[PDB]
Each structure stands twice: as C-alpha cells, then as structure tokens.
C-alpha cells in the first residue's frame, strides 16, 4: 500500500500570509497516460471533507483562488495565498491512482490573531437538575485569543480541584476566537451545604484576572 | 445540485449487525461509482468499500472485508453498506462519497482512479457494550448583569454521541457555541450549547435550545428564561 | 435495402477493444462514397481493395468490428502489427483485405475525472489468433504458485481501464475504430457497390 506523509502535522499560520502544506509518496504518483491522482481534502470540524484539488494542480469548482497545488512524482504542495478564517480545519492528501486510496495523517491549520479578553459568565445550576439529585454549576469564556486560559473554581473561598471538566471550542471560523465552558460538578447535598460559587479566569488579554460569582438562593 | 443523504447511524452491541443507507439525488446514479469512507472519532479519513455504477463490481478495505457487504440499488438511487460483525474499532463517522469518474455497466472497480466528487452528511456509528441514553436538558439562565449577556442549554448524561443543538428552530445562529463532548466518569456524554445575545433581548425575544438525540430517538425542546 | 453503417458508425456508444463488436453486412448494397469522401476520419486505410474500387466490387459478406482505444494504439490495428492491442485485444491477419477506420472521440467518450468504461485486456499467455474476442476474466499468474481466481503478487487481473479525459494528450485520447473486412467465398454474393 501507499503510504504518504504530511508535513507539518499541526500549522499555526497569522492571518492574511501564505501557508504551505507538503505531502510525500513512498511511490511515484504518476499513471502511465501522464497522470497524477492527488487530492487536496478540506475538512471544517464536523462537516463532510471538500476537495480542493484534484491532479496535483487542478482546482474544484466552488474553491477560492488562493488554493494552489503543486509537485510532481512524490513530492507534492498546497499552497495558501493569504490565510482567511474560513481557512480553519484539518487538510488532507489522498493518493487515488492506486487501491487502496489511502491519506495523509492531515495538517491542523489553525490560525492566530489579536488578543481578544474572554467574556466571562457563570451559571448556577438549574431547579430541574437540583430535582434530579445532582448540581451543575457552568462558567463560560466567550471568544477570546490566545487558547491558554485558566479557570479556577472557588467555593466559599475553597478552590476546588478534580470536579471540574472543561471543553474549548474549535477556532471560530467568523472570528477566529476561541470558547471555553468549565462545568464544576457537585451532589445536591454539596450544592445546598454551601453559598458562595466563584469562577476566577487568567488570560493574556486580561490586566488582571476576572471573577464572576453568585450566592445560592439569591437573584 | 447533488446531495447524498446518510441513515441508518446508531449504537450497537459489538458482533451485532446493522445497514446504512445513502440516498444519492441531483445526478445519473447508475452512471458513477459510489463508495463508503469511515473516519474514527480524532482519526483521519479511511476508504472502506466502494461499488461501480451498475453494482457488479465491488472493492473491501482489508479492514472490513468479509465483515461488511457493499450493495446498491440504482431504481431507488440509494447505496447500501451492510455490517457484520462488528467490533469496536469500526466505530466511526460513515460518509458516503461519489467519485468524479465516469463507471458504471461495463466498468470495473479497483480499475478506476481518481477522487470523490462529493460526499454526505455523515453518519456515526458506535460499537460498544452499554446502553442508550436519553440525555437530561437543562436551562442556562442569563442573570441581571451589564450590553451583552449569555445563555445556554446543558445536555447532560447522554450515550452514546452524537446530539444536535439548535437555537430557536435554526431561526438563531449567530453566537451559538456549542461545545464538544466531555465523558465523564459515569461513562454518559454531557455537553452544552450557549449563546451570546445582547441584554435588550431578554424580556422581548423568547430563547429555545432544541436538543436531538437520535440514538436515543429523543427531541427536547427546552426554553432558557431568565430567572 | 441499403446497408447499416449509420448504425455502426453513428452508434451513441462503442465497445472495449477487448470485447469488440461484429456487425454482419449482408443482402444489402454498400455504398461507400459517404465514407471515403468524408472529412471527419483521421484514418482511413484500405489493404488489398482500393476505396474508390469499392464500388465497383461485389463481396459475400462485410463484417463491420468496432470497438475503442487509444490514439496511440490505432496502428496496431493493421496486418503484421505488435503490440497489446495487436496482441491480446484484437490481431488482423497477414492477408487481411479490408480497410481500417479511425476517428478521434474526446468530445463523446471522455470526461472529466476519467471514463473507465473502456476497457482492454493487459495480460495473456499466447497472443490471439486473427479475429478472435477474448472476454476472460481469470486471473493471469505471472509466477509458478496457482492463483485460484483470487488477486495478488504475480497474480493480476488480465484488463485495465483507459480513464480517458478531456485534459489526456491526442495520443491518449479515444478514438473510435472501425474495421471492415470483406470476405471473399465460393458462395453467393450478397453485398455490393
Ligand atoms: C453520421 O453523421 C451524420 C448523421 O447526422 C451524417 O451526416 C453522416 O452521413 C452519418 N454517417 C453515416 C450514415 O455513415
């Protein structure tokens, strides 16, 4: 089987400058008419892939003019005009002269803009999930640069550690910012032992670090 | 245009056995190939089995040959991949891709070259010994606080993945961000899905998450008022 | 009446060199001034009968073989030639007396992406015999270990696909061939000018 191999496996790339993609054949691509069947795949996180390119060098109905595609034999390159935001996603190479089609590891492009401070709520836990037993309380970074953040949760002044699970969001492809949803996770009886649900968050874009809290019972 | 639309995505038992199918439109179905792609959950794309326009000639992944069977009928225009025997490795997002070459009645598979023209929606499929879920639905409420505020849903303890969340029947897209996954210790999914609105909103516009499981055939409409 | 070439030569689709057609000519009159006079052939060449004396000759029976390959491959469809198509797909005998048609069909059977509808045979033990249509599948083993019908090393699958496109240069893109032979018996005639 061909095997073929992408480099870099993750991108980071400013907006508005080139990036380049290679991809490497353990064997020579090209048929015995003259042809070469490389395929560029762009693949937004959960959406169906989209080929950029087909032959090495011919470019999909639909794909803007910045995409380029270049090389010859086993050496082959995707060129990047000027990085956009849409241009956010895991591309991919695929060998399709010879079965099995097999693909590239794919190259995370991800892109890096200005500083953006994070807007930072908190969400005590609902009546309806306090009914069935269990209480969780939400805190949320919305669209901020860059993706180190931190979040710490204080309980009357307590920080906890090890009932917090935190999910970020993939790269806005209208903005380029990131999200962050931290979710402290607590029985009832500990939900209603205490008062005071602190989230404190440490960003770069931030002078200093911003907490939001609420008291139980109180609105 | 061309659209492929996939069913048959769900949880299953591992050794169980179930059919996908992807009703292909927009286009001459007997006149191309059609193939089925699998891409495991953080993995890259992985060509599975593909079929020539008439059906006779048939290609398997060394993965999945003599497991899955690849099938087609052209009257109805839908392609078909059966499943057997599953294990836990075939869990993965199934896409269905038609080739840009032209195949068909006296065409060979594993003979063409080339790459997909376009491909479906996608459907998952999980392989695991446990049982389905209906996730739990609960309102973010947006507080008394500054020109922006923020609400949200939380789908909690669900299995298995995937569920949708929409904002006010798909009529509210902008600030939507629903966030990925996270599995918890008790092996249930739990994610949630918030907004960013502006302040005058609240006490004028009514804020509904719709939440779809489909492995669960479940559908929660819940509405986040600010208490 | 008058005999069918509209039928084999203006025919929506043609066959794979290594399944080519037959089309049996005869009780009809063949007039070939249509087909020699006419601009849209890239070849045209006759052995042993000359186009203009057509015409003018009465013949048993006319087979009309169609079929596609390549632009490259059109001048192993002549007597003595070698070659896969000569060899394996389809052979002309030594005292062939007929004459060859060849036109080129990019704008009908090709696309982009690749038409693998056509089709000719790559492998085969022993070259065919003149005039003679293999249509096997088996798979050629090309080392000493039995194949048993299942693929792999030093065993292959006898046909391949042209994928012909658009974008191919003229020396990969289809052209449609036409061989008409003239057979000649001691037997009734019933074609002629
Ligand atoms: C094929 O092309 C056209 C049909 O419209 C006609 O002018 C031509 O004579 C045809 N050739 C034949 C009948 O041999």
């Known amino acids: ?93 695929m060998q399709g002269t010879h079965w099995p089609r097999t693909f590239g590891q794919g190259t995370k492009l991800e892109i890096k803009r200005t500083v953006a401070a994070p807007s930072v709520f908190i969400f005590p836990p609902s009546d309806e999930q306090l009914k069935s037993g269990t209480a969780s309380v939400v805190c949320l970074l919305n669209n901020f640069y860059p993706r180190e953040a931190k979040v710490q949760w204080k309980v009357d002044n307590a920080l906890q550690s090890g009932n917090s699970q935190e999910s970020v969001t993939e790269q806005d492809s209208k903005d380029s910012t990131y999200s962050l949803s931290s979710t402290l996770t607590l029985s009832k009886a500990d939900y209603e032992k205490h008062k005071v649900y602190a989230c404190e968050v440490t960003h770069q874009g931030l002078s200093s670090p911003v907490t939001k809290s609420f008291n139980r019972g109180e609105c | ?47 599975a089995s593909a079929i020539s326009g008439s059906g006779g000639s048939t290609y398997y992944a060394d993965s999945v040959e003599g497991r899955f069977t690849i099938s087609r009928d052209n009257s109805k225009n839908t392609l078909y991949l059966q499943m057997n025997s599953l294990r836990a490795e075939d869990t993965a997002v199934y896409y269905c891709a038609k080739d840009t070459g032209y195949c068909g009645d006296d065409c060979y598979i594993k003979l063409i070259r080339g790459g997909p023209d376009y491909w479906g929606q996608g459907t998952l499929v999980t392989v695991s010994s446990a049982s389905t879920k209906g996730p739990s639905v609960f309102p973010l409420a947006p507080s008394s606080k500054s020109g922006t505020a923020a609400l949200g849903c939380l789908v909690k303890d669900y299995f298995p993945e995937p569920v949708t969340v929409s904002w006010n029947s798909g009529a509210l897209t902008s600030g939507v961000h629903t966030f990925p996954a996270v599995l918890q210790s008790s092996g249930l999914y739990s994610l949630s899905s918030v907004v960013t609105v502006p302040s005058s909103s609240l006490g004028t516009q009514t804020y509904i998450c719709n939440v779809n499981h489909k492995p669960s055939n479940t559908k929660v409409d819940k509405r986040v008022e600010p208490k | 009446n008058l005999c069918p ?37 890239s070849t045209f060449k006759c052995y042993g009968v000359s186009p203009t004396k057509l015409n003018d000759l009465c013949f048993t029976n006319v087979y009309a073989d169609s079929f596609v390959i390549r632009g490259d491959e059109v001048r192993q469809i002549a007597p003595g030639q070698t070659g896969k198509i000569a060899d394996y797909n389809y052979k002309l005998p030594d005292d062939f007396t007929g004459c060859v048609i060849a036109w080129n069909s990019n704008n009908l059977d090709s696309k982009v992406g690749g038409n693998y509808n056509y089709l000719y045979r790559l492998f085969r033990k ?22 048993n019908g299942v693929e792999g090393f030093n065993c292959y699958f006898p046909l391949q696909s042209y994928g012909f496109q658009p974008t191919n240069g003229v020396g990969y893109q289809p052209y449609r061939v036409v061989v008409l032979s003239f057979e000649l018996l001691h037997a009734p005639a019933t074609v002629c000018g």
């Open chain 1, 1 to 93: 089987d061909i095997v073929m191999t992408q480099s870099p496996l993750s991108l980071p790339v400013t907006l508005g400058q080139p990036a380049s993609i290679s991809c490497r054949s353990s064997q020579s691509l090209v048929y015995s008419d003259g042809n070469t069947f490389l395929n560029w795949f762009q693949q937004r996180p959960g959406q169906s892939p989209r080929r950029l390119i087909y032959q090495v060098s011919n470019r999909d109905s639909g794909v803007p003019d910045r995409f380029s595609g270049s090389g010859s034999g086993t050496d082959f390159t995707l060129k990047i005009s000027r990085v956009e935001a849409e241009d956010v996603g895991v591309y991919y190479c």
């Open chain 2, 1 to 47: 245009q061309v659209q492929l639309l996939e069913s048959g995505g769900g949880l299953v038992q591992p050794g169980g056995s179930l059919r996908l199918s992807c009703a292909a439109s927009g286009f001459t179905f007997s006149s191309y190939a059609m193939s089925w792609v699998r891409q495991a959950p953080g993995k890259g794309l992985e060509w």
């Open chain 3, 5 to 41: 070439f509209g039928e084999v030569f203006n025919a929506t689709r043609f066959a794979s060199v290594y399944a080519w057609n037959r089309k049996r000519i005869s009780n009809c009159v063949a007039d070939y001034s249509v087909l020699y006079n006419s601009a849209s052939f």
């Open chain 3, 126 to 147: 022993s070259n065919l015999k003149p005039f003679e249509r293999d249509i096997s599948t088996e798979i050629y083993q090309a080392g000493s270990t039995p194949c």
